[PDB]
């Protein structure tokens, strides 16, 4: 016998897609707003790993992204394209988040950013802890939930002819944890 | 320049691997962590410690106080036990809600001792004498204060120490148990006499049950199912 | 050759990354630099220099020298601040113009300490005590001298030293003051008595007000916003 | 970073490769091994074990213990091999079922010394003497008893041994024998005297035969061809 298998890192260290953020390709068409997805990077959808954290109090931990996209056209028609290129940008805490396709915050040089050409290996990139304080907080007995940032992802070629919609899965994978104050966990149901 | 081979495997992504990754935010430095008093280091620091066990799980007991004492009486002198279970950590609803249970569920193996305890929390004049009996695996719980006599057993004597502890051994041939469905042995308690008292105080004690892990206990192989 | 394994995050451009590139002229020798004087290294050495403070916004007054001076006067002795000041040093219209708050503007999280000064430039010999009161956080800024001076406070006489300097110390639970919306604490001045002079002289003073970093003053986390 | 040139070869799967393959549960911990007793390192252990050889495969006699015995008797004392029996391990039908010829049918080429057993198990009073000839390679089995005995052979006396080993010795050319189709030698038995016998005890005598590899014996270039 060894714990081993149960310390905190080989219990929270485990690849968990948190979300699937979907785009489409800039049809100029009739493509309303599908041109870009956004999301705020919050564990509280993911009940399982939800729950593990709140197993704690506190807790630190370099969160590691990957990236899988995939694409499809929408049409059984002639659909050709070239290799198309998504951007993937984090947005750290406290920082503009993109509005339009095209809005400024694409650019803005404060947000790190990845250009992963589709088929190929995928993307990853590994923002470290970003509390403002020393560790995130899982409960609050205050007034005035932290943060770690906004994806976003867009696709880069623009006249399309062929509508081209693309899932793009986040597998975020705590690294390098540590947790305070363990509480009794909460019932499976409530979520 | 220097001449390489891809071999099969690269370009995949494997959840379970991990290589340093690219940061994104090289120049930022992190805010130093303070020493918060109460971190964790291994989930088996958490199966050690002793939680309450819902001993009466019935539809109406269950969902608040009610399901963790045990109505100790002095009602006919019946013969059967006090209250038996089965010690199947994950096989059994009672043990399944405990603290340590639920670090089991994230485990498919887990191979280590409980300790149980059994805090009487009656009248302090109260007295009397229970006896409570581990039927090991294999065998079948006792159902008369006799034959659970014969095999191992406290006779815990409610007016000298309001609480009976006891670690139940480990044991398994394929050495981890799993938690899934089908053996791990049992825990009765008998009225040894009955439990006799001085003036008008009542003739309902109660005894609450504790549970939790020994340095021996251990798990492995994770698995996680929580879904919707 | 060498056997590799290609995992993933590779081929995709990684802006926040850096890697040794291949260069375009790699014979061509670099034009060897100079010791120009005034080298900067770090741009808290920016945030070091005091620099003026726009006192008055009030359209008329401001884009013109005008927003920068006090009038000290000599009317109706009224009994509120001078001059109150929010130590927002981002979240006050006031102190975001200055070049602290330039740099500040460039991140989110700082935290240090900042001095102020006020560089009275009325006549040489005029003469006053004028009380410059530091309200800390949390608490509402002073609107009587009398407040003021149960606080801690600077009673600077005019006639004896030009200039009230004071540094403003660091506070913060979140040990790191965010720049967005909300407290920070706040500076007032408050006639202690009125500015008396000799002959003609005008009763008409004015003072300059001075803010920058001092050593303990960082910044991290960079965000640029600047766009059209 | 570093420059590389992937040569040919790369991203091709090659059954026949073993590199690093990253591993899928990098936190599981294994359940340790025991030392349970007889592991084979080797696959020769087993072409090692002298095993019966079928030497009758007569549709009849075959598929029931009929297949191993010899049927030694005392009839008309003719002048032929009790038993011949072709050395081709693998290009023998008789010797092919063996498990010596088992391991054998996964290689290709194999080279090694035989060694054979002739266990006599008729009547403890039983008693003659049979003479056992080893026909080198090339050769032709010897058809008379005189022949054999002008070869190499032992003269086996069933009265004081109830049997004869007797290692055949290695040889090939090609310093590697083919299991496929064509020489190897053979191995026959000479009823040297007939089987005499003291009162009632019956005329029918039987004798075992046996085969395994020496250490000499090796095998190289594996071979599986079992499907459906």
């Given at each position: 016998?060894?714990?081993?298998?149960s310390?905190?890192?080989?219990?929270?260290?485990?690849?968990?897609?948190?979300?699937?953020?979907?785009?489409?390709?800039?049809?100029?068409?009739?493509?309303?707003?599908?041109?870009?997805?956004?999301?705020?990077?919050?564990?509280?959808?993911?009940?399982?790993?939800?729950?593990?954290?709140?197993?704690?109090?506190?807790?630190?931990?370099?969160?590691?992204?990957?990236?899988?996209?995939?694409?499809?056209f929408?049409?059984t028609?002639?659909?050709?394209?070239?290799?198309?290129?998504?951007?993937?940008?984090?947005?750290?805490?406290?920082?503009?988040?993109?509005?339009?396709?095209?809005?400024?915050?694409?650019?803005?040089?404060?947000?790190?950013?990845?250009?992963?050409?589709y088929?190929?290996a995928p993307?990853?990139?590994?923002?470290?802890?970003?509390?403002?304080?020393?560790?995130?907080?899982?409960?609050?007995?205050?007034?005035?939930?932290?943060?770690?940032?906004?994806?976003?992802?867009?696709?880069?070629?623009?006249?399309?002819?062929?509508?081209v919609?693309?899932?793009?899965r986040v597998?975020?994978?705590?690294?390098?944890?540590?947790?305070?104050?363990?509480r009794?966990?909460?019932?499976?149901?409530?979520? | 320049?220097?001449?390489v081979?891809?071999?099969?495997?690269?370009?995949?992504?494997?959840?379970?691997?991990?290589?340093?990754?690219?940061?994104?935010?090289?120049?930022?430095?992190?805010?130093?962590?303070?020493?918060?008093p109460?971190?964790v280091?291994?989930?088996?620091?958490?199966?050690?410690?002793?939680?309450?066990?819902?001993?009466?799980?019935?539809?109406?007991?269950?969902?608040?106080?009610?399901?963790?004492?045990?109505?100790?009486?002095?009602?006919?002198?019946?013969?059967?036990?006090?209250?038996?279970?089965?010690?199947?950590?994950?096989?059994?609803?009672?043990?399944?809600?405990?603290?340590l249970?639920?670090?089991?569920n994230?485990?498919?193996?887990?191979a280590?001792?409980?300790?149980?305890?059994?805090?009487?929390?009656?009248?302090?004049?109260?007295?009397?004498?229970?006896?409570?009996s581990?039927?090991?695996?294999?065998?079948?719980?006792?159902?008369?204060?006799?034959?659970?006599?014969?095999?191992?057993?406290?006779?815990?004597?409610?007016?000298?120490?309001?609480?009976?502890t006891?670690?139940?051994?480990?044991?398994?041939?394929?050495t981890?148990?799993?938690?899934?469905?089908?053996?791990?042995?049992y825990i009765?308690?008998?009225?040894?006499?009955?439990?006799?008292?001085?003036?008008?105080?009542?003739?309902?004690?109660?005894?609450?049950?504790?549970?939790?892990?020994?340095?021996?206990?251990?798990?492995?192989?994770?698995?996680?199912?929580?879904?919707?």
């Amino acid at each position: 016998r060894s714990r081993s298998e149960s310390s905190i890192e080989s219990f929270f260290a485990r690849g968990a897609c948190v979300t699937i953020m979907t785009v489409d390709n800039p049809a100029s068409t009739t493509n309303k707003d599908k041109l870009f997805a956004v999301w705020k990077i919050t564990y509280k959808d993911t009940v399982q790993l939800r729950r593990k954290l709140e197993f704690f109090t506190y807790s630190r931990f370099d969160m590691e992204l990957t990236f899988v996209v995939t694409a499809n056209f929408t049409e059984t028609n002639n659909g050709h394209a070239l290799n198309q290129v998504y951007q993937i940008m984090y947005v750290p805490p406290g920082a503009p988040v993109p509005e339009k396709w095209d809005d400024y915050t694409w650019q803005t040089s404060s947000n790190p950013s990845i250009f992963y050409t589709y088929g190929t290996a995928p993307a990853r990139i590994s923002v470290p802890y970003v509390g403002i304080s020393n560790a995130y907080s899982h409960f609050y007995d205050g007034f005035s939930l932290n943060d770690f940032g906004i994806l976003a992802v867009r696709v880069v070629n623009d006249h399309n002819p062929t509508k081209v919609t693309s899932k793009i899965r986040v597998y975020l994978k705590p690294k390098h944890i540590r947790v305070w104050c363990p509480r009794p966990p909460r019932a499976v149901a409530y979520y | 320049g220097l001449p390489v081979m891809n071999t099969p495997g690269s370009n995949q992504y494997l959840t379970a691997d991990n290589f340093q990754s690219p940061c994104a935010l090289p120049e930022f430095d992190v805010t130093p962590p303070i020493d918060i008093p109460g971190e964790v280091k291994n989930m088996m620091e958490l199966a050690e410690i002793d939680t309450m066990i819902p001993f009466d799980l019935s539809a109406t007991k269950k969902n608040t106080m009610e399901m963790y004492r045990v109505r100790l009486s002095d009602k006919p002198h019946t013969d059967d036990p006090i209250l038996c279970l089965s010690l199947s950590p994950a096989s059994d609803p009672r043990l399944s809600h405990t603290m340590l249970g639920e670090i089991l569920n994230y485990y498919t193996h887990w191979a280590g001792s409980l300790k149980f305890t059994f805090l009487f929390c009656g009248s302090m004049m109260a007295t009397g004498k229970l006896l409570v009996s581990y039927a090991p695996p294999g065998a079948d719980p006792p159902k008369k204060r006799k034959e659970a006599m014969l095999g191992t057993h406290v006779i815990w004597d409610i007016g000298l120490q309001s609480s009976c502890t006891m670690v139940v051994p480990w044991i398994s041939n394929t050495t981890y148990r799993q938690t899934i469905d089908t053996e791990g042995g049992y825990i009765s308690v008998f009225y040894q006499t009955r439990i006799v008292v001085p003036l008008s105080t009542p003739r309902e004690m109660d005894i609450l049950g504790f549970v939790s892990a020994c340095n021996d206990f251990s798990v492995r192989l994770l698995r996680d199912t929580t879904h919707i």
